[PDB]
Curated annotation (Swiss-Prot):
Residues 4-63 form the CSD domain. Induction: In response to low temperature. Binds to the pentamer sequences ATTGG and CCAAT with highest affinity in single-stranded DNA, and also to other sequences. Has greater affinity for ATTGG than CCAAT. Can act as transcriptional activator of cold shock genes by recognizing putative ATTGG-box elements present in promoter regions of genes induced under cold shock conditions. This is Cold shock protein CspB. GO terms for biological process: regulation of gene expression. Disruption phenotype: A double cshB-cspB disruption mutant cannot be made. Homodimer. Interacts with RNA helicase CshB when cells are transcriptionally active. SMART domains: CSP. The gene is cspB. Signal peptide: none annotated. PANTHER family: COLD SHOCK DOMAIN CONTAINING PROTEINS.
Amino acid sequence: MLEGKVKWFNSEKGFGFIEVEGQDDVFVHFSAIQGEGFKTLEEGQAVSFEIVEGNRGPQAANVTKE
Ligand SMILES: [Mg+2]
Ligand code: NA
């Protein structure tokens, strides 16, 4: 599990990017967010996550707010 922070997140549509010091930003969709409640993220929030890649390229998976 990787660690980073939310660079920005469009809460209306439910996507944004996670920034990771010294690595490429990682796209995050709301469907990757763990936990209860409305799935959303705020700029600057600390997260743990994994990167999942298929034919569409890499995105965040298993995103937990820390
Ligand atoms: Mg950067
Ligand atoms: Na939820």
